[PDB]
Structures are given as C-alpha cells and as structure tokens.
Amino acid sequence: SSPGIWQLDCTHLEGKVILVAVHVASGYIEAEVIPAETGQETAYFLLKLAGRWPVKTVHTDNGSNFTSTTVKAACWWAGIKQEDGIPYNPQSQGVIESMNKELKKIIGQVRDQAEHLKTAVQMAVFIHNHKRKGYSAGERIVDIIATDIQ
Amino acid sequence: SSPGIWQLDCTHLEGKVILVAVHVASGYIEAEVIPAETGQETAYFLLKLAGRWPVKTVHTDNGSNFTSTTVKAACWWAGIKQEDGIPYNPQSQGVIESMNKELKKIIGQVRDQAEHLKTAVQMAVFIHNHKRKGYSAGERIVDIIATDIQ
Ligand SMILES: Nc1noc2ccccc12
Ligand SMILES: Nc1noc2ccccc12
C-alpha cells in the first residue's frame, strides 16, 4: 500500500552521516545527523519516524540494516514490514541520488547561517518539504495519507 | 487558523527534560529528551517540527523561551508566529497536565523494554499518536491539515 511506503537513504558529508527517510509517493523526508550508521541508530530513527507517520513498509538502505537484529526489533515493535531496497526499477536509484545532491546543495547554501551540521540538515529538510513543484512534498504526503484514511 | 497551532510543553522525569509539541486541534505530539531546556535546544526542536508539519503559530511554554533571542530567530527562520502560552481558557492547562501524566504512565509501562529514556519517550509518542479515542491523533492531524489545504 503506497501511502505507507518509505525508503531509507544514508548519505555522507563533512566526515558525518546523514540518515534520511523518504516517503516514496510524495518525496517528503525526515532526516538526522548521526555519528555513524549503526543498527542501534537506524532502529531509533525508525521508531521516531513510525511514531510520527503511518509507516507500513520500509525499504532498507543496505544489507547490514536489513540483517540487523536491532533494526528488525524496532520494525517489529513499530509494526513495520522490513524490506530490501533493491531498485528492481533502476530509475528509483537515480531519484535518490538526485535528492542527496539537492540536499547537499541546500546544506551548502545555509552554511553562513548554521554553526552545526545538524541545524543545516534540518534547514534542508524544511526547504525540501516546503518546495513547490504546484504542490509541496508536505502537502502531497498529507493529501495521500488523508485520502487513504477516508 | 487552528490547523497551524501548536503548543510547547516541558515536563521532567529521571532528572531529565522532555520537550513536547502538541498540535492543539488533534492532540498529536512530537517529543524529545534534552539535557536541559535552553533557548538553543528549544530553537532546534522548533526547526525540526516546522520542517515536518505546517507550523503557523506556537504557544511557547514559558517566558524564558518567549523572550529567547535564539527561539525568536528560529521562529523567524521557519515562518512561525511566536505567541505566549497563557491559558486565557483555563481548561487548557489541565489538558496538558493530563497529557504529561499519560505520557509518564506509558514511559513507565515500557521501561522493561527500553534501556535509555529517549527510546521510552519515542515509544510513548508512538503509543500516544496511534491510540484510538473513533480516530487516533495521527489520523486527526492529517485530516485537519488535508481539509485546510483543500
Ligand atoms: N506535514 C505537512 N503537511 O503540510 C506540510 C507543508 C510543509 C511541510 C510539511 C507539511
Ligand atoms: N501522521 C500520521 N498520519 O496518520 C497517523 C497515524 C498514526 C500516527 C501518525 C500518523
């Protein structure tokens, strides 16, 4: 069920790790800076996400997170179906790649404003989700989920 | 209007500080554990919130956060109208008080599961937002915002 499908994405900047969850149907994102991509960090991130949006399915970003007992435990706890993240459709991967580039671009544009990377990342989340493409990703996710509920 | 109104709430547990944002019309929440309630922590929390939901107005939890230049800067950045949190309607306070008690109750119920308070708090957010009262707070916020957009 497409309203409930999210994709994990891990990208790197400034020797640091940015973990992103993308709501596939809308392009809406949540993101966090973590010191490294561990099972425990990913598990906690998913718990936060699922408390905030109705997350039914997660396409994990790599095999380590797919295998992780801690990630599996979090998915069990939160009622998430954990799936692999293989682009059986190869255009999917280029979309994520483009988003990572966009996000890094925005991060660069706010570095006269933010002392810490985590602030810049949250500014990028804001700008990304409010950007009008015409509706924004934020508007799209709410519309999609509301239509599903009704 | 009412779709964009949030209330800040700071509560204490285990010598630690739990910062909560409540979407007043739905009862939907986001929350975080912070070491102490500073302007910088509150500012960052609001930035995260506003990137994720269309936050128009925030009723601040106390006068220190209302006064804080850092909080004011974050509200400016994110396009949030910063307001006081005075219960001109006195029933408002008791509602928040009840929610804090409920949240602490859930936190207690999951402490055989979570090593760290932050995990327990996010479990509480999940349980709170999914609880059916009949719709859940999560369903209500999406419906309210979607209706506003349309
Ligand atoms: N969750 C949201 N509904 O509408 C939005 C507009 C901008 C950002 C987030 C949202
Ligand atoms: N943002 C949400 N839409 O629906 C939900 C159901 C449960 C929790 C959160 C949400």
What spatial distance separates the first Cα and last Cα of chain B, rounded to whole Å? 14
Domains of chain B: 1-150 (3.30.420.10)
Which tokens belong to A95?
């979309």
Q: What is the residue whose two structure tokens read 């992780």?
A: A68
How many other β-carbons are positioned within 10 Å of the β-carbon of residue A51? Answer: 23
Report which bound ligand comes closest to the CA of A28: 1
- CA neighbor of B39 nearest in space, from B61, B7, B16: B61
Which tokens belong to B13?
């547990």
Gap between the Cα atoms of B36 and B19, Å rounded: 9
Gap between the Cα atoms of A23 and A7, Å rounded: 7
- Please give, one letter per residue, the 3-state secondary structure of B105-144: HHHHHCCCCCCCHHHHHHHHHHHHHHCECCCEHHHHHHHH
3-state DSSP assignment of residue A9: strand
Q: Do A143 and B143 touch (CB under 8 A)?
A: no
Q: Do A125 and B30 touch (CB under 8 A)?
A: no
- CA neighbor of B27 nearest in space, from B78, B92, B86, B121: B92
Ligand 1 centre and the CA of B13: distance in Å?
31
β-bridge pairing B81-83 and A16-23? unpaired
A73 membership: H or E segment, kind and range: helix A69-78
Gap between the Cα atoms of A48 and A70, Å rounded: 14
Q: Which residues contact A53 (CB under 8 A, 6 or more apart)?
A: A6, A23, A141, A145, B138
User: What resolution in Å is listed for this PDB structure?
Assistant: 1.7
Residue A80 contacts residue A46 (beta carbons within 8 Å): yes
Which tokens belong to B78?
């994110």
Report which bound ligand comes closest to the CA of A137: 1
**B123: nearest CB among A47, A53, A139:** A47
Residue B102 contacts residue B131 (beta carbons within 8 Å): no
Chain A residues with CB under 8 Å of B18 CB are none
Phi, psi (5° rounding) for residue A12? -125, 145
Determination approach = X-ray
Chain breaks in chain A (C to N over 2.5 A) after: 133
Ligand 1 centre and the CA of B120: distance in Å?
26
State the greatest distance between any 2 C-alpha atoms of chain A, in Å, as a whole number: 44
B→A interface, C-beta within 8 Å? 30, 44, 47-48, 50-54, 77-78, 113, 118-119, 122-123, 125-126, 129-130, 138-139, 142-143, 145-147, 149-150
Gap between the Cα atoms of A130 and B52, Å rounded: 9
For A14-134, strand residue ranges (E) read 16-23, 28-34, 57-59, 81-83
Residue A80 contacts residue A2 (beta carbons within 8 Å): no
- CA neighbor of B41 nearest in space, from B23, B15, B16, B24: B16
Q: Which residues contact B49 (CB under 8 A, 6 or more apart)?
A: B6, B21, B30, B55
Q: Which residues contact B122 (CB under 8 A, 6 or more apart)?
A: A44, A47, A48, A51, B31
Residue A88's Cα: distance from chain center in Å? 19
State the greatest distance between any 2 C-alpha atoms of chain B, in Å, as a whole number: 45
Residue B25 contacts residue B3 (beta carbons within 8 Å): yes
Q: Which residues contact B67 (CB under 8 A, 6 or more apart)?
A: none
Chain B residues with CB under 8 Å of A47 CB are 119, 122-123, 126
Choose the mutation target among B18, B122, B131, B135 for the interface with A, i.e. most A CBs under 10 Å.
B122
Backbone Cα Rg of chain B: 15
